[PDB]
Amino acid sequence: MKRLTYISKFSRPLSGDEIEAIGRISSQKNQQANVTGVLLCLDGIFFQILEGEAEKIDRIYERILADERHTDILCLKSEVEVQERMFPDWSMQTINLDENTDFLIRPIKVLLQTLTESHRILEKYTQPSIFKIISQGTNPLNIRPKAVEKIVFFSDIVSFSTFAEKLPVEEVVSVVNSYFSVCTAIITRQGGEVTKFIGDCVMAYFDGDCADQAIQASLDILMELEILRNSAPEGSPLRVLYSGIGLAKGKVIEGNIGSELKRDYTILGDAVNVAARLEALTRQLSQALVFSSEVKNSATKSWNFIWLTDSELKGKSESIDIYSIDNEMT
Amino acid sequence: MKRLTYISKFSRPLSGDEIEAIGRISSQKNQQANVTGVLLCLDGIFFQILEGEAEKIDRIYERILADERHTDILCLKSEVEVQERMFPDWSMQTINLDENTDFLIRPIKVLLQTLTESHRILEKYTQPSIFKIISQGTNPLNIRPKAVEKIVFFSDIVSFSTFAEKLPVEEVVSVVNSYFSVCTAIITRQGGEVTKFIGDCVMAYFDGDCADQAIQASLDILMELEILRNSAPEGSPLRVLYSGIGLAKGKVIEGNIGSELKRDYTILGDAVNVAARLEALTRQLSQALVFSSEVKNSATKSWNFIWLTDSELKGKSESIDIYSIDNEMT
Ligand SMILES: Cc1cc2nc3c(=O)[nH]c(=O)nc-3n(C[C@H](O)[C@H](O)[C@H](O)COP(=O)(O)O)c2cc1C
Numbered sequence: 001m002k003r004l005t006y007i008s009k010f011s012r013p014l015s016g017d018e019i020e021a022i023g024r025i026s027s028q029k030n031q032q033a034n035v036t037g038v039l040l041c042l043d044g045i046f047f048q049i050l051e052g053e054a055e056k057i058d059r060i061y062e063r064i065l066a067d068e069r070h071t072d073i074l075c076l077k078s079e080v081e082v083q084e085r086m087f088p089d090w091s092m093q094t095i096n097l098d099e100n101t102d103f104l105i106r107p108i109k110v111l112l113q114t115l116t117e118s119h120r121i122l123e124k125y126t127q128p129s130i131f132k133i134i135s136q137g138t139n140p141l142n143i144r145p146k147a148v149e150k151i152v153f154f155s156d157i158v159s160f161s162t163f164a165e166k167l168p169v170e171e172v173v174s175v176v177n178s179y180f181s182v183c184t185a186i187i188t189r190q191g192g193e194v195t196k197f198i199g200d201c202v203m204a205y206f207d208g209d210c211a212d213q214a215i216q217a218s219l220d221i222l223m224e225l226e227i228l229r230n231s232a233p234e235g236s237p238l239r240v241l242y243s244g245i246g247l248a249k250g251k252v253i254e255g256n257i258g259s260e261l262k263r264d265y266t267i268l269g270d271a272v273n274v275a276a277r278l279e280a281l282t283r284q285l286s287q288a289l290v291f292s293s294e295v296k297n298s299a300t301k302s303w304n305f306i307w308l309t310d311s312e313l314k315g316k317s318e319s320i321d322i323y324s325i326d327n328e329m330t
Numbered sequence: 331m332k333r334l335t336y337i338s339k340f341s342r343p344l345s346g347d348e349i350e351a352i353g354r355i356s357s358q359k360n361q362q363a364n365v366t367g368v369l370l371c372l373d374g375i376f377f378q379i380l381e382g383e384a385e386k387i388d389r390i391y392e393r394i395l396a397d398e399r400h401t402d403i404l405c406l407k408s409e410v411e412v413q414e415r416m417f418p419d420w421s422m423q424t425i426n427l428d429e430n431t432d433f434l435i436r437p438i439k440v441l442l443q444t445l446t447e448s449h450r451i452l453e454k455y456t457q458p459s460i461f462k463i464i465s466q467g468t469n470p471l472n473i474r475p476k477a478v479e480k481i482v483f484f485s486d487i488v489s490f491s492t493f494a495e496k497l498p499v500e501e502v503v504s505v506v507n508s509y510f511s512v513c514t515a516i517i518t519r520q521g522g523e524v525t526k527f528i529g530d531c532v533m534a535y536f537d538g539d540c541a542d543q544a545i546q547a548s549l550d551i552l553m554e555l556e557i558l559r560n561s562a563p564e565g566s567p568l569r570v571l572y573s574g575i576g577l578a579k580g581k582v583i584e585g586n587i588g589s590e591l592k593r594d595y596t597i598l599g600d601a602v603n604v605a606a607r608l609e610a611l612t613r614q615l616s617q618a619l620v621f622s623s624e625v626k627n628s629a630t631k632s633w634n635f636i637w638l639t640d641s642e643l644k645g646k647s648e649s650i651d652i653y654s655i656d657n658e659m660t
Pocket residue numbers: 008022025026027029030037039046048050060063064065066067069070092
């Protein structure tokens with residue numbers, strides 16, 4: 001028996017009778033799948049708890065995510081291996097709190113709207129990786145630091161300073177946000193983790209043995225930016241949006257770094273400097289992507305590697321061989 | 331009539347009869363101050379809503395913060411100018427939810443514990459500045475970007491790379507966390523805002539006309555680190571913890587920067603590069619603090635300025651005069 005707690009936002013106003021409809025059909029289908037649950041709503045928020053044989057709970061969740069009447073689904077708690085039902089009588093109890101006027105419910109309702117509204121805001125300033133840890137029972141604050149090998153990804157906008165100097169405030173922030181959205185979408189898709197924004201710079205990291213995914217994410221970004229420059233409206237700043245990318249591999253510390261006020265779950269190590277140095281090198285070269293030989297040698301696909309005989313490393317130890325990929329992008 | 335919503339964590343286990351005690355005395359004192367309220371608890375969490383003439387609500391909050399039986403107080407919502415009471419009958423209704431076994435309360439209780447536990451974790455990965463915006467009614471996600479003058483503060487550990495190379499993982503993270511805690515405590519005290527951690531680096535910012543507070547925060551850090559080196563145990567890594575500090579002034583963009591997944595409320599501008607360049611200069615010099623002439627000229631106190639005739643700026647336009655403060659720290 002799995003059990004699943006999630007909250008979501010109405011995709012549009014819903015009458016109490018439309019919510020009742022969701023309640024009824026949910027009851028008929030849950031009663032068949034052995035599922036019991038409770039569906040709460042409170043001023044445009046859905047809350048649901050759903051429990052049953054995991055396999056069937058997974059299918060039900062999957063089509064719940066497919067329903068157009070709510071959006072911003074966030075799984076708050078996923079319990080596996082539960083040995084007893086919380087609400088064993090209700091296939092689906094629908095509790096509409098907008099209409100419930102009991103006086104013991106008065107205070108509990110106002111807190112719930114306060115905490116949920118607050119929590120929804122904090123979500124957008126949080127990395128979605130923390131929520132994956134939270135949902136699955138682990139308190140991320142209690143993870144202990146560890147030394148681990150990573151591919152470190154650095155990307156930085158070329159000559160961002162001139163956007164700022166010649167463009168309105170709203171427009172400059174639109175350019176950098178568009179860039180971070182393109183990069184974030186592609187890195188996450190390839191298994192990487194965007195861990196920090198540093199001005200016009202994206203710092204992400206991949207598992208140590210995911211050099212092929214790092215290289216492919218980098219090539220797809222460069223492809224996505226080319227398509228974005230060519231397709232932008234007449235006179236759009238997106239037409240002159242270029243990026244460099246540097247990749248390096250090495251052993252870094254991963255853990256909670258910060259003060260009492262505020263911590264980050266992120267990495268720390270020399271491989272971060274190297275990837276930053278490699279990314280800056282791309283201003284010197286005609287290639288937009290450069291990466292270390294340890295990245296080259298950790299790739300398993302037969303990439304079209306090109307050896308950059310001009311290495312140029314400063315602040316490093318042994319001379320660093322720099323490679324790129326030879327294609328029409330570079 | 332103000333109204334105040336806060337949550338806190340028990341500082342120690344509390345019997346239901348101790349919680350009842352808090353309820354009774356709260357009732358007797360609230361009834362006198364015209365205050366009505368509701369005090370909820372749920373597995374080591376206090377929730378309270380309190381309303382009355384702001385002036386008297388402020389005094390009551392102040393001694394609530396002084397009570398040793400709860401900790402981690404976070405004000406969730408502060409409403410000013412309220413024109414009607416939510417709970418006009420109860421001076422203090424105490425609702426113990428650990429004991430309430432009603433079945434309409436069953437689901438609402440389990441969600442509340444889920445959201446609160448989740449929210450408490452997210453607090454520690456959030457900047458406390460966001461909560462000040464949230465509590466006071468403003469949705470920070472809806473603030474629009476703006477060009478504004480700031481003092482930018484950069485500080486960076488000297489030769490952190492050798493801590494990592496020669497120390498255990500747990501110990502390295504202890505050193506950098508101790509450093510971020512010292513800096514954060516002093517900057518916040520002087521009115522500055524710590525906005526980003528970048529490896530072993532602290533990036534904070536002050537209001538544009540707070541050069542004196544920026545300079546004083548910097549001097550106090552250097553003083554605090556000296557005391558921390560001299561007082562550390564025999565053989566402690568804290569004995570070799572040194573920092574540089576760079577300050578620069580200029581017009582920066584402030585606003586929400588990031589992707590759909592994750593945003594930061596932070597700044598963007600050339601003054602950030604300059605402060606980073608000035609901080610790195612301190613490795614060349616015997617002074618641990620260096621700052622631009624625009625910082626020097628924005629100070630109103632008669633500081634003991636010293637003109638550093640060796641300027642050395644690269645990536646800047648007009649030659650930058652670099653100043654420091656002449657004292658036994660430098
Ligand atoms: C907040 C919300 C919660 C829902 N919960 C359930 C549920 O628990 N069980 C279920 O079968 N359908 C649930 N649904 C509806 C499903 O997404 C889907 O519409 C339904 O299962 C399809 O059944 P049908 O093909 O017979 O019409 C929910 C919809 C919404 C908006």
